[PDB]
């Protein structure tokens, strides 16, 4: 089993791999975008934009399982890559490997007031104002964790 934790979403976070009854991390040594492509497509998250290292999503609490991932970007599982082997690692938890995938989505307001922006495919972007029902504004405001309703306003 593979999972991403502390990512603020579903398709991002520190890569946690499961082995021997414990959830362990992956060291970020030689953890390039090819390694991130495998875990993102394995998790049904499309391609990958970032192969984050140096514990970008926090330092994991578990035995580092893999050290030198040499994925070609074509296999469907992370453990099918060429690595040093299970448990063989010379890394700490300060350099756990995490990924940010194509299907990772984040929401923000930039001036809780400002232009509604959505983060998809690794690039921030606005949201169309057409057919913006009050329920959608309430959902957006609630997702920002600051309201349950809001008002659509013209650009500043």
């Amino acid at each position: 089993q593979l999972r991403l934790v502390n990512g603020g979403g579903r398709c991002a976070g520190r890569v946690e791999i499961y082995h021997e009854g414990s959830w362990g991390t992956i060291c970020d040594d030689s953890w390039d975008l090819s390694d991130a492509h495998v875990v993102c497509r394995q998790l049904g998250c499309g391609e990958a934009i970032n192969a984050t290292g140096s514990a970008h999503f926090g330092e994991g609490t578990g035995p580092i399982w893999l050290d030198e991932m040499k994925c070609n970007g074509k296999e469907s599982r992370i453990w099918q890559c060429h690595s040093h082997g299970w448990g063989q690692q010379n890394c700490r938890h300060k350099e756990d490997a995490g990924v940010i995938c194509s299907e990772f989505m984040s929401l923000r307001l930039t001036s809780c007031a400002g232009r509604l922006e959505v983060f998809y495919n690794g690039a921030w972007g606005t949201v169309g104002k057409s057919s913006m029902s009050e329920t959608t504004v309430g959902v957006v405001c609630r997702q920002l964790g600051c309201a349950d309703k809001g008002k659509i306003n013209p650009a500043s």
Binding site: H84, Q88, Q89, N90
Partner: protein
């Protein structure tokens, strides 16, 4: 290693399958026990004139600062228990060579002469016939007591 292991066998290691290194980068370690003091010219193997090697040449140690604690530590290093006495003069021989003026300041509680604080800079000259010596007890089970 955590630094507290008794042997490198107990150290956890992290092997790498790829290329390791070049011989032009081999590691060398210098430890603190470099004294190289031995016992020579004695009836029983581990007593006699104290002989010390520095600067690539052996030499006899002066008895001016050769207290009974130094003899005790030297006997412990050579695994012969305690030191019975330090016979002054050339009882075991003056020694064919020069006299080393090293002033070991052992407290008698260390098991190696390298652990002792040795002072050899500017030490006063020693008479030729005043060469330090030691007669160890010879019993390994014998241990020093305060």
């Amino acid at each position: 290693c955590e630094g507290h292991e008794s042997h490198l066998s107990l150290c956890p290691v992290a092997p790498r399958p790829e290329g390791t290194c070049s011989h032009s980068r081999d590691v060398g370690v210098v430890c603190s026990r470099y004294t190289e003091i031995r016992l020579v010219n004695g009836k029983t193997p581990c007593e006699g004139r104290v002989e010390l090697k520095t600067l690539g040449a052996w030499g006899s140690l002066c008895n001016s600062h050769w207290d009974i604690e130094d003899a005790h530590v030297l006997c412990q290093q050579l695994k012969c228990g305690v030191a019975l006495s330090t016979p002054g003069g050339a009882r075991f021989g003056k020694g064919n060579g020069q006299i080393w003026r090293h002033m070991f300041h052992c407290t008698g509680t260390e098991q190696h002469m390298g652990d002792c604080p040795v002072t050899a800079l500017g030490a006063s000259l020693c008479p030729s016939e005043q060469v330090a010596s030691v007669i160890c007890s010879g019993n390994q089970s014998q241990t020093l007591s305060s």
